[PDB]
């Protein structure tokens, strides 16, 4: 029901036979020419390998298509990807804080593994 590249609702969906995943024709045809392989599974795939109705009710107030609607579309594309670039940058920063704190904990455990068993060992030796 959607395309597995853009996040569309395809007008001419086409399925690849190597990995069962429906893409919109234009977007899958572009990928194969860029690099001849399936985008998801990274398996060999060509244009000939591919195997080929939706209603949108055009608003009552449908000038706006040139001015207001088209403007909003390129606003919504612009401010989303910019905000999405902001999200990717923080995930990598928050990655570094995760791995550092993880390795910090590893050293605590390693330090405490020597501490505990030797404290237990000392109790076993005390008896003697």
């Amino acid at each position: 029901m959607l395309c597995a590249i853009s996040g569309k609702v395809p007008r001419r969906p086409v399925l690849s036979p190597k990995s069962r995943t429906i893409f919109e024709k234009s977007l899958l045809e572009q990928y194969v020419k860029d690099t001849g392989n399936d985008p998801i599974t990274n398996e060999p795939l060509s244009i000939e390998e591919i195997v080929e109705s939706a209603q949108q009710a055009s608003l009552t107030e449908s000038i706006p298509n040139l001015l207001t609607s088209l403007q909003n579309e390129w606003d919504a594309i612009m401010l989303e990807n910019f905000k999405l670039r902001s999200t990717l940058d923080s995930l990598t920063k928050k990655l570094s804080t995760v791995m550092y704190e993880r390795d910090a904990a590893k050293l605590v455990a390693a330090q405490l593994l020597m501490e505990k068993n030797e404290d237990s060992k000392d109790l076993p030796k005390s008896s003697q």
């Binding site: 000038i63 612009m78 910019f82 704190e101 910090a104 605590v108």
Partner: protein
């Protein structure tokens, strides 16, 4: 690595305690064309490029310039009135046919919500048994530990 979640029934103070010890060990260690340039600039600056605010206002007895602007309003209003005719002909049938499609699209998502829900609870379900298996074995070990501890004393 090993820390039993289900079995260890571990206060907020212990999280605050362990956080400080982890904190102290962190104290120690410390592809598009021109399109992308204007898009990133538009988003960064927070300003959308201005469109043609002309067709809406205009003015009568203008000049050769408003003669064009007037003739624009006619053709688009005729296109408008033709663009409203083919909508009203079908009317609400075209709208409700798309409304039905949206219900098929919605239900599919919530089926996946359940499939994920089931397998997520199923993994946790397997973990639970493991936690209770070993937690007993650790209990067995500690009891035996305490027995020696006093046994070795009472011999001496």
């Amino acid at each position: 690595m090993d820390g039993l979640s289900f079995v260890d029934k571990i206060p907020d103070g212990y999280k605050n305690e362990i956080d400080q010890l982890v904190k102290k060990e962190f104290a120690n260690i410390k592809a598009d064309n021109s399109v992308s340039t204007l898009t990133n600039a538009l988003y960064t600056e927070y300003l959308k490029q201005r469109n043609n605010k002309k067709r809406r206002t205009p003015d009568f007895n203008d000049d050769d310039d408003t003669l064009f602007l007037e003739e624009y309003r006619r053709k688009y209003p005729r296109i408008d009135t033709s663009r409203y005719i083919p909508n009203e002909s079908s009317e609400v049938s075209l709208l409700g046919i798309v409304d039905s499609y949206l219900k098929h699209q919605e239900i599919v998502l919530d089926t996946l919500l359940p499939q994920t829900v089931s397998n997520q609870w199923r993994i946790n379900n397997d973990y639970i048994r493991q936690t209770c298996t070993i937690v007993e074995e650790m209990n067995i070990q500690q009891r035996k530990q305490i027995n020696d501890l006093e046994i070795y004393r009472k011999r001496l």
